[PDB]
Amino acid sequence: VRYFYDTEFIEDGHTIELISIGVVAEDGREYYAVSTEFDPERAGSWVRTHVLPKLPPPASQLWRSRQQIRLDLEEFLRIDGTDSIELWAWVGAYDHVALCQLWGPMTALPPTVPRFTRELRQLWEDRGCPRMPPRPRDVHDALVDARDQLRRFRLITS
């Protein structure tokens, strides 16, 4: 059913160029990939310092084409499966677009992928803002960040 995710990307007010994606299923499965298709030269200051250095070394199989990431996610999210898929992220409007654009325009999103991502911050605030683990060491690694989202959600719903 539930997947927690995060993306890193280069966004210029016009497009969102996907750097990486981390997704963690409530059942414990984890997916992380980094795109071979974004242009590192086009990254602004904040990304160069905080995002770029934390990426896998160049020879890692974690590096995948946009097409591989799409096919990886269709398998990882079980899009042909029994269960209803429910996507979650923390302040994920841009993340939601970044994920969806792996498929193309919204019309080309697979029929079982939700057309919205639930907002963890919204749930957090609606439960009166309960005390959370402080920020992990490596924030801006999308998988670490996606992990911490699931941790947060479990706390709030315990």
Annotated binding residues for Mg(2+), written as ranges, equal 6
Side chain identity at residue 29, one-letter code: R
Compose the 82-101 pattern: x for residues touching a copy of itself by CB under 8 A, - for all others: ---------xxxx-xx--xx
Task: Please give the structure tokens belonging to residue 146.
Answer: 């996606």
CA distances from 22 to 48, 80, 95 (A): 19, 21, 11
Bridge partners (DSSP) of residue 67 are none
Q: Is 104 exposed, middle or buried (0-12, 13-18, 19+ CB in 10 A)?
A: exposed
Nearer to a copy of itself, 56 or 155 (CB): 155
* β-strands 30-35, 16-25 pairing: antiparallel
Residue whose C-beta lies closest to Mg ion:
67
x/- map, 98-127, a copy of itself, by CB under 8 A: --xx-xxxxxx------xxxxx-xxx--x-
Question: In whole angstroms, what is the distance from residue 139 CA to residue 38 CA?
Answer: 20
55 binds a copy of itself (CB under 8 A): no
Question: Rule CB under 5 A: which residues touch Mg ion?
Answer: 6-9, 65-67, 89-90, 92, 95, 149
Question: Rule CB under 8 A: which residues touch a copy of itself?
Answer: 11-16, 44, 46, 91-94, 96-97, 100-101, 103-108, 115-119, 121-123, 126
